[PDB]
């Protein structure tokens, strides 16, 4: 007449869990992410058809972000390692002005510099020349000739680079769970971390995510479909950043309108080095365009959403950042392998109140580059010949609020985001991982 | 008809499969292939004859060859990685003659090179000299004094090589299947390549195969038990090579008939370099002695076999190769670490028709050698003291057909082929690898 303990196996029960996901490629041979160890996967989605289970999960709890971050850094080292060290070039560098019809706002940007260099034989040294960008060159002695410079990072970890074939194309990588695990995708198109997701469909493999890395305006990511969503770990914390996911793409057209020559020399025994040569045509500043309408009016949507976290009849202002290292001060992206830094002066200036014309931002070029989060290594960015033009999609903003405001008005926001991880937090916000626990017990009646 | 399915487990069914076989060995301390880590071999492999089985499998499409290829190349570098780099020696060499009694074949073969050597302290260099073979030395400048030369590859990837301690003996390695896999073996000696084998047995491990590298003749391999066999993928496709397995060895006695000394220098911190010192006695060229009668019989037998698939009233000419770089114009082989490049024209200068006394083949010696499959890596063979007398068995040939002839007659064959995969084709023709599939459907009468 009483109840008995029965074990059931194959029970559909979830447990919060952590493990790793596998690299799953979909359709020059190898890139940081296009890793040689990566397994082509099944393009067919594995849906559970919106099975009616409500689950609460969030960002900044999601350890998958940490894995994407670590995997990418590991991958960088793997592709960067089997390349030519540039240590032989850490010599006194002899600099003067480039004199080629320079436009006034480009004066001082480029340096014509000579140096001694190693060659095929170890008892021989030769005189060589190249063109450098000002930002990476530092003066060594006011007391001596005003022409003596060194490269910015010769007194720290060696700067290395070769492998010109390899690109930096941010090829999307899909991630797959091991058997015994499942990935929960939130199908709510209007959620935030402030509550549970009513509609979840698990998968074995996610869609691909492009490892695009940016410092201020996130490019080529997932766009919101129904509205603009603003997310934060703590909406009232001045120490946290703000992620703005736009539902409106903004097109941005970038260029370095200077026709370059790439020259190369032998440094040593099969050790090649590539460098900037003769620039032909006028010297002009690199720049990026957006239209005013797609920026200025788009921000009004952002403002309407900001006002949902702030009160009514609140004034909102945009402004430029407080500064700091170039890496955080300006917008930064890579294209063609080149690293561009842009001053968003025309983007964050206006004030919003309760009640063909473009924007052009000036940009600069840098070649000796550390990793966003570390200085124990440095890499050199090789030159690109001819003229480079790039077009990208702005999908979101990373903003920083000021240290409060007086009586909840004139709330000021600036470009921000100092955490490289923000680039994946913005994509993985829809996913959680659990383990499968097939055993369980319930009362019943039998023998 | 009122029947039901049973399933039997432990069913004897095979599936073609490609997996890794592992290095098996009887056991000086450091060999290139007989490495520190290799698993002891089964002293008693169990060969099981299969009654009522005919199994078809390939030659030349057999991936066991590919597995040895990738492993031998990768291992070559791993075992020979921690060697002294010879980069420090890339200085100009001031070249003069050798102060000895030099014979007429040796004129121009050796050079006496003088240079400023790097010592273990950064403050010192010394006057040093060494002897080199002509093949490895290139003139630096006709414009300047025609006495300055360089090592052949100082203007490309650096040459690295020391490791005098490493054994290069071609110790045979056995390959064993993982559980769940089996190796099938063909005992039909009359098979001509790919087709059904009516006489088979299975094994757990293959016999051992000696890693002998060669560009023309097959040395110390598997010998035919009855008659010379000629096998190829397509007898009329001259883009493919020809494998000839002999049923008798041909003994060949090779020498570098000069009593050598060795000198050395410390270049850096334990960075020792060894080089050819002077010569005791006079100077004579390297050579190999092949029995004429044996060789004549050898090619006569080859012709008898050629005539099985080709017709009569054809004169078969044996000729020296048409050309190419050294590796494909000479018979390359290694004798105790010494690298011989022998001229075999003396072996292929005759005709056959359908109706002791040795051949003293001249040889050259070379020390700067590129890896067989690539030129991104090279090594400087260490000098060897004393006089070497190298004795080996010719167990086969790799031949190339001079395809294209008037009226399909008077064919000519030449030696050649430097592709290492072709040196394992004979030994591996007997083996196939399959997966074991233990479940099978068993229709019957039970419930």
């Amino acid at each position, epitope marked *: 007449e009483n109840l008995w303990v029965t074990v059931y196996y194959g029970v559909p029960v979830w447990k919060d869990a952590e493990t790793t996901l596998f690299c799953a490629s979909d359709a020059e041979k190898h890139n940081v992410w296009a890793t040689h160890a990566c397994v082509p996967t099944d393009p067919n989605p594995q849906e559970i058809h919106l099975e009616n289970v409500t689950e609460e999960f969030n960002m900044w709890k999601n350890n998958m972000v940490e894995q994407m971050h670590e995997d990418i850094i590991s991958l960088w080292d793997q592709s960067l390692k089997p390349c030519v060290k540039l240590t032989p070039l850490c010599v006194t560098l002899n600099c003067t002005n480039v004199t080629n019809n320079i436009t006034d706002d480009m004066r001082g940007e480029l340096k014509n510099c000579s140096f001694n260099a190693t060659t095929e034989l170890r*008892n*021989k040294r030769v005189k060589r020349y190249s063109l450098f960008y000002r930002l990476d060159i530092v003066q060594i002695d006011s007391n001596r000739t005003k022409s003596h410079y060194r490269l910015i990072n010769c007194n720290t970890s060696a700067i290395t680079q070769a492998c010109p074939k390899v690109s930096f194309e941010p090829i999307p990588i899909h991630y797959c769970a091991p058997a015994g695990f499942a990935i929960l995708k939130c199908k709510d198109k209007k959620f935030n971390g402030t509550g549970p997701c009513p509609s979840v469909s698990t998968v074995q493999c996610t869609h691909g995510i492009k490892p695009v890395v940016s410092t201020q305006l996130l490019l080529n990511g997932s766009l919101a479909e129904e509205e603009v969503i603003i997310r934060s770990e703590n909406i009232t914390n001045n120490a946290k950043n703000i992620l703005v996911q736009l539902n409106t793409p903004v097109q941005i057209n970038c260029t370095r309108p200077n026709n370059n020559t790439v020259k190369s020399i032998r440094i040593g025994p099969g050790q090649a080095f590539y460098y900037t040569g003769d620039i032909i045509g006028d010297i002009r500043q690199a720049h990026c365009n957006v239209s005013k309408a797609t920026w200025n009016e788009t921000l009004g949507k952002v403002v309407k959403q900001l006002r949902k976290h702030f009160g009514n009849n609140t004034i909102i202002r945009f402004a430029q950042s407080s500064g700091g290292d170039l890496e955080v001060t300006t917008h930064s992206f890579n294209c063609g392998g080149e690293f561009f830094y842009c001053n968003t002066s025309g983007l964050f200036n206006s004030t919003w109140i309760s009640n063909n014309d473009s924007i052009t931002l000036p940009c600069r070029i840098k070649q000796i580059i550390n990793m966003w989060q570390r200085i124990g290594q440095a890499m050199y960015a090789p030159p690109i010949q001819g003229v480079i033009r790039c077009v990208s999609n702005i999908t979101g903003l990373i903003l920083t609020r000021d240290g409060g405001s007086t009586n909840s008005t004139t709330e000021t926001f600036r470009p921000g985001g100092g955490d490289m991880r923000d680039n994946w937090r913005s994509e993985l916000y829809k996913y959680k991982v659990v383990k499968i626990e097939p055993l369980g017990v319930a009362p019943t009646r039998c023998k | 008809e009122n029947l039901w399915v049973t399933v039997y487990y432990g069913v004897p069914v095979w599936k073609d499969a490609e997996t890794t076989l592992f290095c098996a060995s009887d056991a000086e301390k450091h060999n290139v292939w007989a490495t520190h880590a290799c698993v002891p071999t089964d002293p008693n492999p169990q060969e099981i004859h299969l009654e009522n089985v005919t199994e078809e499998f390939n030659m030349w499409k057999n991936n066991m060859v590919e597995q040895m290829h990738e492993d031998i190349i990768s291992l070559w570098d791993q075992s020979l990685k921690p060697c002294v780099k010879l980069t420090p020696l890339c200085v100009t060499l001031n070249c003069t003659n050798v102060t000895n009694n030099i014979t007429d074949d040796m004129r121009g073969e050796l050079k006496n090179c003088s240079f400023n050597a790097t010592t273990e302290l950064r403050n010192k*260099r010394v006057k040093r000299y060494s002897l080199f073979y002509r093949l490895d030395i290139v003139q630096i400048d006709s414009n300047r004094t025609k006495s300055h030369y360089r090592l052949i590859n100082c203007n490309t990837s650096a040459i690295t090589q020391a490791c005098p301690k490493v054994s290069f003996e071609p110790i045979p390695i056995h390959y064993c299947a993982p559980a769940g896999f089996a190796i099938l073996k063909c005992k039909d000696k009359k098979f001509n390549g790919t087709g059904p084998c009516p006489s088979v047995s299975t094994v757990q491990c293959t016999h051992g195969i000696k890693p002998v590298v060669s560009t023309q003749l097959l040395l110390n391999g598997s010998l035919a038990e009855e008659e010379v066999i000629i096998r190829s993928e397509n007898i009329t496709n001259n883009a493919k090579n020809i494998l000839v397995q002999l049923n008798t060895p041909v003994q060949i006695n090779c020498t570098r008939p000069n009593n050598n000394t060795v000198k050395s220098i410390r270049i850096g911190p334990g960075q020792a370099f060894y080089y050819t010192g002077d010569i005791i006695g006079d100077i004579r060229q390297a050579h190999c002695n092949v029995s004429k009668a044996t060789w004549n019989e050898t090619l006569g037998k080859v012709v008898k076999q050629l005539r099985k698939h080709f017709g009569n009233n054809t004169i078969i000419r044996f000729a020296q190769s048409s050309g190419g770089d050294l590796e494909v114009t000479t018979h390359s082989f290694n004798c105790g670490g010494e690298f011989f490049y022998c001229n075999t024209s003396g072996l292929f200068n005759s005709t056959w028709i359908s109706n002791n006394d040795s051949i003293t083949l001249p040889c050259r010696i070379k020390q700067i050698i590129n890896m067989w499959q690539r030129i991104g890596q090279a090594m400087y063979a260490p000098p060897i003291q004393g006089v070497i007398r190298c004795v080996s068995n010719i167990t086969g040939l790799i031949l190339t057909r001079d395809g294209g002839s008037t009226n399909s007659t008077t064919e000519t064959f030449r030696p050649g082929g430097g592709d290492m995969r072709d040196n394992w084709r004979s030994e591996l023709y007997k083996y196939k690898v399959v997966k074991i599939e233990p479940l099978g459907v068993a229709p019957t009468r039970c419930k």
Partner: antibody
Amino acid sequence: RLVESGGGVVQPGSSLRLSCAASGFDFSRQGMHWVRQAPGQGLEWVAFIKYDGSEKYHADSVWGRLSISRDNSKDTLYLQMNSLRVEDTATYFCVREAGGPDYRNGYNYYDFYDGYYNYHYMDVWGKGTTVTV
Amino acid sequence: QSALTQPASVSGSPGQSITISCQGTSNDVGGYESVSWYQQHPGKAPKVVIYDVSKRPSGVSNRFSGSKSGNTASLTISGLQAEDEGDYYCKSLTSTRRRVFGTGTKLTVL
């Protein structure tokens, strides 16, 4: 081996062009000089040209009228002499400048495109050719 | 650009030590150690006797020496021989980077 050619007898106000064939050296990496000596007189330096043609130096006494030039492919040194004066009568000589690599800190030092530095003295003289105005 | 001043002539008996002076300025002799001396056999282009103030080229004997003090330089010929007879010249480099020769000295062996 320096061989002067183009000398001859001309009238005042005329122009003459000299050339110097050369061999035995990487002409293209070494500088050259023209020197002249009027009969009964001492040596007068006329001009110097750097191996890559980047810098040229002329004596004040010959300015405007004389111009030094070179052809790396021809392995040839030239002197263009215009509006000739009787004072310009002299034997003209093709002279190779002494040079090579500076030795410093146990290394040799080259100029651009592996050029040889000026050891600062004359080494090879040609026979010379007479120019009479 | 003026010539360097040299004595019109020098002389001495065989075996005699003689000196041929050269007077320059702060822009050349007193400017660098780049001075040199040449021997011109009559009818021939000259050869280097001295370079770098006091260095000899291969083939020149140790009888040929010299020195430099301030703006004045000199060639010393010890053990004077009849075979030494010829026209001697000094040469120097300048701030303008021009090359300058002296007036030359005639040598007679008595």
